[PDB]
Each structure stands twice: as C-alpha cells, then as structure tokens.
Design a binder for this molecule. Sequence first.
Ligand SMILES: [Mg+2]
Ligand SMILES: [Mg+2]
Ligand SMILES: [Mg+2]
Ligand SMILES: [Mg+2]
Ligand SMILES: [Mg+2]
Ligand SMILES: [Mg+2]
Ligand SMILES: [Mg+2]
Ligand SMILES: [Mg+2]
Ligand SMILES: [Mg+2]
Ligand SMILES: [Mg+2]
Ligand SMILES: [Zn+2]
Lengths: 220, 97, 86, 135, 99, 130
Amino acid sequence: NDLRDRILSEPLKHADFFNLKELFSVRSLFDARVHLGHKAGCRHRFMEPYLFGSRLGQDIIDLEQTAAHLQLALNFTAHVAYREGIILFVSRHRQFAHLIETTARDCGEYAHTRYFKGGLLTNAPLLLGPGVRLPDLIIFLHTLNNVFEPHVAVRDAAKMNIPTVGIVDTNCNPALITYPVPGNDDSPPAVRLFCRLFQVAISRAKEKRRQVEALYRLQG
Amino acid sequence: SNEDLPVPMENPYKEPLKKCILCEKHVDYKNVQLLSQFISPFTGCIYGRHITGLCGKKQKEITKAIKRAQILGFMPVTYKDPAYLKDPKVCNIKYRE
Amino acid sequence: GKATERADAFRKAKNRAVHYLHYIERYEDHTIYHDISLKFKRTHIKMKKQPRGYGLHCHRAIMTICRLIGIKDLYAKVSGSVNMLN
Amino acid sequence: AGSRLETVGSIFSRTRDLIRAGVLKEKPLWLDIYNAFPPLREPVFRRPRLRYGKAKAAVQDIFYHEDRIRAKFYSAYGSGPKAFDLFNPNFKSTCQRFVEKYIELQRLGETDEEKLFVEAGKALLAEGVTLRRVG
Amino acid sequence: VESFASMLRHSPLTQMGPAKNKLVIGQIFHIVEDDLYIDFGGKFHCVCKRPEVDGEKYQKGTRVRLRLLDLELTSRFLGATTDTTILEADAVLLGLQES
Amino acid sequence: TVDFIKKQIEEFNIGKRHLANMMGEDPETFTQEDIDRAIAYLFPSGLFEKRARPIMKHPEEIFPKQRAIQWGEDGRPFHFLFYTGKQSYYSLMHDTYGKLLDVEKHHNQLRAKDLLAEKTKILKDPIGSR
RNA sequence: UGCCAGCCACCGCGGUCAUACGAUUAACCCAAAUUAAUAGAUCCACGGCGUAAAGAGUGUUUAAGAAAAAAAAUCACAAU
Ligand SMILES: [Mg+2]
Ligand SMILES: [Mg+2]
Ligand SMILES: [Mg+2]
Ligand SMILES: [Mg+2]
Ligand SMILES: [Mg+2]
Ligand SMILES: [Mg+2]
Ligand SMILES: [Mg+2]
Ligand SMILES: [Mg+2]
Ligand SMILES: [Mg+2]
Ligand SMILES: [Mg+2]
Ligand SMILES: [Zn+2]
C-alpha cells in the first residue's frame, strides 16, 4: 500500500510527464483549419476572449490560446487515463460518428455518439444497472447537438461533478466545460487531428502506466 | 513587436450601394412618358416599392409628380396613354401568364 | 418532495435533499463573515453579523436553517414576501 | 452523496467544500489532477445575458495594408486566372504576386498610385501571367 | 517560432479575401445518387449536382473547379437571437481539374 | 442468480435420472421428447393453455435469458458502447456502417482500377427471403 | 341537543355523526387574582405608479429646484 501512493504521486510532481508538447504546434493546428470559426452573427457572447478577430464576417480563433488550452486539456486527459479513469467521448454530430466510435475502440475508452437519453448520467442506477461506475472524464468533440442547443451531458457532468474537456466552437458555451479548447469542430481535418491527439495521449498514458507497474514489480 | 498584426483601417472591399433607377436624376410632372412607366396600363394604379425598386426619395417624388400631372391635365387617371404604352418595361410585375 | 401520501412525501424530500447541498462559509463557526442584504424574487432578507452573545434572533425558519447549518449567532430580518420556498 | 447544484459555482469548489465539511469522505481521482494543473478559467456557471443599448462586442475586424491592394486588384482584374488552392499551405496566388510586386514598387520610392499599379500590371507580363481586365 | 498572426497573414484564405465569385479547387469526398459533396477546403463542404456532361467521370476523390458564392450560409429571422447556419457552403460547378 | 441456475441444472439432471428410473427407459437414451410424454402421463393436467401445463425443461430454457455482466470487478464496463443504453444494437449498427464504408472504399478502388467482378445478389424472390 | 338550544378576537362549529354547544372527568396557563369591554404605547410610504391604487389629454410659464465631466442647435415625405 505504501508503494501504491508513490505511483499516483509520481506524475503529479512533473509538468510535462507524458511529453505531450511534441504532439502538436501552432502550425499543426493551422494546417487543420482549427483557427476558422462561424460567422459573426453566430458568435456566442462568451467566445469574445477566445477570438483573434473577424475576417469579413467570419471570426478567427486565436491559435495561441487554442494551444495554451489544448496543452492543459491533453495533460488532464492523460492523467485521468494514467490513474485508471473511465473516459467517455460524447459527441452528437452525424458526420464523424463512425470515426469517434473507432477512435474510442482503439483507445479502449467508451463512446456515446447516438441520441442521449434523459436520465442517463443522473438516473444511472436505473438506466445502466443496479450499481455502476460513472465516467471519470467526459470529452466533447461537438458541444452542440443537431438542434443547435447545449448538450445534455455537459450539464449532467457539472451536476454530477464529472470533469469535462470540450472542443468549443464560436457558437458554443464554455461556461460549464472544465477544460474548454477554442477550435473548429466542423472541419474533417480538425476533427481528425483532435481524434488522433486524444488517441495518442491515451495510448501513451496506458503504456507508461504499464511500464510503471512493471518497474513497481521489480521494486520488490 | 509583431508587424503582422491587423490594423484598424476601413474596409477596402466595401461594395458601392445600389442605386435606384432614377438615382441622381430629375423627376418632372410634365414627362407623361416617364410617369406612365410606373402605372398599370389597364387600371392606372401607381406601383409600389416592391414593384418599382426605387430608393426612398424617388418613389415619393414620382408619386407626387403623378398626382400633380393627373390633376393639371397632362396624364389620364383611368388608363395609361396608348402612345406611351409601347415604352420599355421597368416594373417587375407580370399579369399575363 | 410531493407525493400522494404524507409518509411518501417525507421520504422523497429526505432522499432528494441530500443531492442538493450547499456549503456555508461561517466566520469562527458562529457567525457570517459580513452583513448580507439580498433581494430575491419578492422577498428581501437583511442579515447582520452578531457577536458571541447574540444567538439566533432571526425568523422561526431561518433560526432552524442556521441551527442545522451550524450557525449559532445571527440576526436576520425578512421584509416583503413571506413565502417559505422563496 | 454530493451536490447537484449548477449555478452556485464550479465543480472543483463543490467537491472541495464537501470534503472540507466532511460529507464526501472519498476524494475523487480527478481532484488531485485539477489541483496539480488548474485550468485557465474556473468552470463557474455564467448566464449568457443579452447585450442591449450602445454596448458592442470587443472583437475587432482583421484587416491589413495588403487588403487595400487586393481590393484594387479585384476591382479591375477580379479573380485571377490561376484558381486558388486552399490545400497547399504555401500557395501563392495571382493577387499575392501582384501585392508582392506592389510592396517592392513602393520600396522603390514610387508614391503615385497609378505608378504603383500599372507598373506592377506590366511587370506581371515579364513573369508571364495573363491578366483579364473586367470592363 | 512562427506566430499565429504571421501565418494567418500569409494564409491562402486571407489572400482570397471576399468569397464572392472566386475560382477555387475542391475535392469530392462523398458521393450520393445525384448530389456531390465537394470540399473546397475553406471551412465547410458544398453540395452540387452532377452535370449531364461527363457525369460518370465524377468519382470519390475527384478534383473539380468551383466558383465560390458564399463561405457559409447564415441568415437572421423573426425572433431569432442568432443566425441560422446551414452547415454548408454555396458554390457552383464549372469543370473537373482542367489541366 | 448464476448460482441459482447452476443448482437448478443439477436438480434438473437428478430429476431426469429419477424420471427415467421410474418410467423404465434408459437414462442415456432419455431425451426431451420422452420427458414431455412422461410429464404428460404422470401429471395429466387438462388445460386449454399449453403453457399452463406442467413442464420440466433445462434451466436455460425455462428461465429467461440473462444480460451478461456488463462490467468487471474494477467497475470498468467491457463493451465500449455501454454508456449508450443499447450496447448490442449500437455495436451492430456500428459494425454494419463500418462494413458499408469498407465496401464503398473497395468498390471505389475497383472502379478506379476498372474492375467489375461483383454481381447483384439482392433479388432473392425464388428463395423467399424476408 | 341535533343548523334547535347555542359558541367565537379571525377562520368558523352545530347531520341519533360535536376534542368548537351545555354537563362530568382529565389536562394546560396564570394566580389573590382570572376573564370581558373601552382606552392607550407601537403599528402606513426613504415603498410603488404596464396588467392589482397610482404617469394626471397636451404644451408654455410664476414660485421653486438640480445645472455636479464634455458634447448639440436646422432639413426629402401627410404640422397648421
Ligand atoms: Mg461549429
Ligand atoms: Mg364557550
Ligand atoms: Mg353526540
Ligand atoms: Mg376554541
Ligand atoms: Mg365545550
Ligand atoms: Mg391584582
Ligand atoms: Mg403599501
Ligand atoms: Mg390601474
Ligand atoms: Mg400621458
Ligand atoms: Mg381623465
Ligand atoms: Zn435613388
């Protein structure tokens, strides 16, 4: 038991424990059309600090702050996977649902790209089973549903005290998202880049957890 | 210290505003040929903005000129003059289908 | 908690009150940090910080709420509406 | 059990104060991660109130001195013969070549707009691009 | 280290400027019976109709030429706080990578 | 309820052995067809509803099918679509869509290579397929 | 007893169906005092005026009040 707390305390003492800086850069985000957002009329009021400007009606997201938020979001996602946490990729968008399902299957985490039932996260002991374990992290690839309204899961995670890492567009509300990352969720290159980043972060976290366990076995 | 920052300047891509057909023109009460183009040949009604397509001043000026000419004895009220009936069509209303 | 039977309503209220819990910052565990003047929908509440020897001279419901919270000394006045829920 | 209140504050605060009071006797695994790497903004609920009156958003439009030459190029020649390729990161367009010629002509000590325009238009013929003026 | 403003100033979209009557190159990524989803690459994907001439030559991955009309179709209506995004773009078909 | 079904299996086996012994047939050759006749003869319940008659089948046949244990001892669910409500239906839909995409890519490659070797097998009128 | 007798500061109670009427027991609070009535102290708004009471049918002006940081006066169209 004494050696178990050391494993959990090891990554908390280092800033870049999993070396996630090499995964992306400003140019990598720029090449994926991340900086591009909706028109000025679709701009949310809370998205003003997360915007670089407006290019003839279309607002532009500042990739400097995009990457600044993305570093923390990826570090938080990697730590949850390292600490054996349940990660649920929730996204309601009928274009990349198969890609999200495949990325989650490859990660070994859980996914939800279909219609979200009402009492799913709240009335869990009746919707999922007698006794279930709530997801320890919720990842949003598309904050808005098909009705252009905030998703149920972003509110339910805040209600049930579940951290949420979410890609927020210019028309999204980052108020309830624990780790919002301003970007574009409608570009296929951007969504593929985000899926690959969240895939490699989880893969590295699990591989490093396995290596740390192997070292712990040799410790005694 | 960055020289690539945007500058708060005027929009260079500002398109010119659309002009009415009589923009920067002189409307008169004596040009019955001009006044007849905005009236119905069969009834004599004065076409509205959605039919003519004139910006705010010229529609009212044409209406006033038509009303003045119909009473001064220059243009018939009940019908359009067959002499000016063969004028080019400026209105956007189609009757015969 | 609302139910056809009184016992069922009591049980539902007891079971559903735990899910909604606030944390109250209590100065020295006896009073509040500063005087609070709040205006709800139609109820105005004016609460003033009180010393050790002035214990719960408030409305009969605010006194019970503060006793359950842990506040031992407080003065409060309610003006306007007297609706219990508000 | 916990606190299902949304508008009161943030999840970190609502999880920390519960343990501080002693209701939540089990510390969540994500609380340590939040303490180690807090986000830039605390996840507190903010109501999107509508903006009325003379108040306007603080977002500023994106414009450069290059746009003042691009508008002139598009007014006369319009879209260039070479179609734009958005896939290529380092793609240079016909108007990009025109503005690159224009800045060098400005550096050459020419202040007249006609001199800066017609000279670039004729110099593009040296490279060999076709300009289609719109009448 | 290149800056975001520096790369945005040299971005092809910035050079394009207004999206009215601009010739662009797009690549088709999805195929329907009569509709073609062409990704011109700016933000969204436009939808066009297969022409009568050389209709069979339009396949998945084919590169075509477009005359872009609007980058994103949004409009305001009665009682609408924000715009109604169409999640698409307006463009027309002219040719298929004439080279 | 796994141990209940496990005990019911043993009870069914011993009851089948005793039924074969009391009926006089070989327990090795004793089958469900003989079980039905033995039950009908020993307990002649005359009722119009056949489900109301006495029945002795395997526990997996009598008791309804049970949903598998969705999560391990650590609490982590097994299937990646557990939080979707209908994990089996959604996995079937996902597999169908993945196979559709694979078929589309393969057919696109075949069309690019100018190879048409597939046939139309959708018409199953003579077979009577629904 | 049974909308009868009757009781009450407000709500209200009286059905061969009364913990509210009359009687008994029991119980509670005061106390050489206990109730009823009349007087008092206190209690209305430093609050509102679209739908509950409230923006007076309109403009100008006397008295009176604030000028607390700076700006402005005037143009198509049916005032009279
Ligand atoms: Mg979006
Ligand atoms: Mg009495
Ligand atoms: Mg009686
Ligand atoms: Mg009484
Ligand atoms: Mg009595
Ligand atoms: Mg006395
Ligand atoms: Mg009052
Ligand atoms: Mg009134
Ligand atoms: Mg009035
Ligand atoms: Mg009156
Ligand atoms: Zn005009």
